Design a protein around this ligand. Structure first.
Ligand SMILES: CC(C)(O)[C@H]1CC[C@H](NC(=O)c2cnc3cc(N4CCC4)ncc3c2)CC1
Ligand SMILES: CC(C)(O)[C@H]1CC[C@H](NC(=O)c2cnc3cc(N4CCC4)ncc3c2)CC1
Ligand SMILES: N[C@@H](CCC(=O)N[C@@H](CS)C(=O)NCC(=O)O)C(=O)O
Lengths: 199, 199
């Protein structure tokens, strides 16, 4: 076992996927959370100035989805074939493109209201129908067992539900997915233990 | 042999990385390019509404980065160690994030200009510096041989230079990586044979 040190804001954000993988695989790591006041002092230290980073034996990794992929390679969470690993990556990227559309950094809180409302009213419902069709009559998004794509669905939807809490009212299959992930004893164990933040 | 059929616009866009990968590996495939007129109909066909897609022997893949990662999985484009493949993904995600910031589909013209300018004036230089720094004196972005991250760097920068020609004027080391990538024989042939599109 190597030693690990995760560094991110005190929020779920883009680090939650990594904490989910860590928890599912039973990997003791350090979850180092910073205040946004300590962000300028640390940004210059970072390779490309963005967070999260994972340190494994003095080696800094960046980019959440690349770290997530790195930590699940050769694990059940990855998918069983290159095609299945491709589908995991397509779903993750698709969810991620939509999570990234939101103007989290927009300082004008008025303008951040508008874009958020539009994406949650026009964009998101279409996407929730694409997932539903894609999932079909499977329990999990890819194959016949959990992958970190499912983890990612749960993480993304948790944060989309905070804003539009009725987002899945016409999609109980996507709610059951959320519950199947929250049912994984290691994941459930961490969902209760984790710090309670909005995002 | 397996059969491949790729569909995207008649432009480099987010399909070009796949095309580069097919060249390097000497893989025969159909480069299907759709007219911008046939786009509204084809969306209904597409899984999550985005292109490119890659049909493979009667299976459809989406998400250009997930597709590229599939085609490079067992090849030398993918990286020499498990840590280095993480780094390959991380550089590509760092570059895709920056390409994705741009409002390629913005319907309002005035919005499109203000953001492009903004990103080329302040953001792009910061990223150029950070990449240059990451590259150091080495030959390829990652490890000691070419990866598809190096392909991605050439593809992104080709599109960026169209809007900012003085982009790399202070980073000859990154220009050298372009030229090195462009001189790989399988790639050099493709740049010359591909359709000359703006983006
Ligand atoms: C300029 C500042 C103050 O330094 C920063 C501004 C942006 C802010 N970022 C967010 O508040 C935020 C929260 N949650 C997210 C969740 C996701 N999802 C994809 C999987 C979950 N993506 C992106 C997310 C961004 C951090 C502080
Ligand atoms: C009018 C339509 C039909 O609605 C479309 C709107 C979107 C628009 N998109 C682009 O023109 C475009 C071009 N080049 C790109 C390059 C990259 N890069 C990552 C590696 C290079 N990414 C994204 C890119 C998007 C096409 C027309
Ligand atoms: N998207 C990459 C980079 C993450 C990123 O951009 N993080 C933000 C906060 S979540 C940051 O470090 N600075 C603010 C910003 O990028 O707008 C990842 O998943 O790791």
């Amino acid at each position: 076992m190597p030693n690990y040190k995760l560094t991110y804001f005190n929020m779920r954000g883009r680090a939650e996927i990594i904490r989910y993988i860590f928890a599912y695989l039973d990997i003791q790591y350090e979850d180092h959370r910073i205040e946004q006041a300590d962000w300028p002092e640390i940004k210059s230290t970072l390779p490309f100035g963005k967070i999260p980073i994972l340190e494994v034996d003095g080696l800094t990794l960046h980019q959440s989805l690349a770290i997530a992929r790195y930590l699940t390679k050769n694990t059940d969470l990855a998918g069983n074939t290159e095609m299945e690993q491709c589908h995991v990556d397509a779903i993750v990227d698709t969810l991620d493109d939509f999570m990234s559309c939101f103007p989290w950094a927009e300082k004008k809180q008025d303008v951040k209201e508008q874009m958020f409302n539009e994406l949650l009213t026009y964009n998101a419902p279409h996407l929730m129908q694409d997932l539903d069709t894609y999932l079909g009559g499977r329990e999990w998004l890819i194959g016949n067992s959990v992958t970190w794509a499912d983890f990612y669905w749960e993480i993304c939807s948790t944060t989309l539900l905070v804003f539009k809490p009725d987002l899945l009212d016409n999609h109980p299959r996507l709610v059951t997915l959320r519950k199947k992930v929250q049912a994984i004893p290691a994941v459930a164990n961490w969902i209760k233990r984790r710090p309670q933040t909005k995002l």
